[PDB]
From a paper:
To gain molecular insight into [name] and its RNA-binding mode, we crystallized the mature form of mouse [name] and determined its structure to 2.0 Å resolution by selenomethionine SAD. The structure (residues 74–294) has the shape of a hook that is comprised of three domains. Residues 27–73 were disordered, probably due to pronounced flexibility. Domain 1 is composed of three α-helices forming a helical bundle and domains 2 and 3 each contain four β-strands that face two α-helices forming 2-layer (αβ)-sandwiches. The centrally located domain 2 provides a platform for contacts with domains 1 and 3. In contrast, no interactions are formed between domains 1 and 3. Instead, a large tunnel with approximate dimensions 23 × 14 × 12 Å3 is formed between them. [name], with its open state, appears more flexible with a rather high averaged B-factor of ≈57 Å2 in comparison to ≈35 Å2 for Aq1575, suggesting that the interaction between domains 1 and 3 provides rigidity to the structure. Domain 1 is widely positively charged, domain 2 has both positively and negatively charged patches and domain 3 is predominantly negatively charged. Indeed, RNA binding was severely compromised with a quintuple mutation (R74A, S75A, R76A, S79A and K80A) at the base of the hook of domain 1.
Numbering used by the authors: 74 to 294
Write the structure that this text describes.
């Protein structure tokens, strides 16, 4: 799909800015390229994204408010910050939201280590034990989650800086880290009703449809 390919181009460009255009030296870029190939993105399109100048485009993070007092984080890569800012504000405003003024940083980038509910010794890890190990590893928060199977899991949240150390300590303490990742976490969440939920989805969809948007984050529970 052409919209998918446009987003995947933005992701290639952002990965080249962070680690260079050689996927042998940039594992994040290598993962994106694999996904591109899995979606049947033509080589010509991949190469054009790969060979775009590292200095082209501005990476942008805009905060806004949606329907029911929700909070939004709009992640974008644009050739014109002013057009992108005006356009995102227009999309927010036309769908009942608003652009947050100033330096409201309602979302924080955080590290996230996912780990299974079983020790190296294949013994159960209950929440109380996950919490004690989180203290010892320097994790800021622990969430109980489920994957698509489904099956139980633990999400250990930390300072984005410390992602490296925490995964390592969790492994040294006997836990089984499945995956590492960066996520944008809001300070608090809101609950929306049905009329507000459908509106929020409409606004989010409109923002995802904008050409420069990579991702939209929200605090809707």
């Amino acid at each position: 799909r052409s919209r998918i390919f446009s987003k995947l181009t933005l992701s290639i460009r952002l990965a080249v800015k962070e680690g260079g255009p050689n996927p042998e030296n940039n594992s994040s870029l290598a993962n994106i390229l694999e996904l591109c190939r899995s979606k049947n993105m033509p080589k010509s399109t991949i190469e054009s994204a790969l060979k775009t100048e590292k200095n082209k485009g501005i990476y942008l993070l805009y905060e806004g408010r949606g329907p029911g007092g929700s909070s939004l984080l709009i992640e974008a890569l644009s050739n014109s910050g002013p057009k992108c800012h005006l356009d995102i504000k227009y999309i927010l405003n036309k769908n009942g939201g608003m652009m947050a003024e100033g330096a409201r940083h309602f979302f924080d980038k955080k590290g996230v280590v996912v780990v299974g509910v079983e020790d190296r010794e294949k013994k159960a890890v209950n929440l109380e034990r996950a919490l004690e190990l989180a203290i010892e590893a320097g994790a800021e928060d622990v969430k109980e989650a489920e994957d698509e199977e489904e099956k139980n899991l633990f999400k250990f949240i930390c300072d984005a800086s410390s992602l490296h150390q925490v995964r390592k300590k969790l492994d040294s303490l006997g836990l089984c880290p499945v995956s590492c990742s960066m996520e944008f976490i809001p300070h608090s969440k809101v609950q929306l009703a049905e009329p507000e939920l459908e509106q929020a989805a409409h606004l989010i969809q409109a923002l995802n449809n904008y050409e420069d948007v990579i991702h939209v984050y929200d605090n809707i529970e």
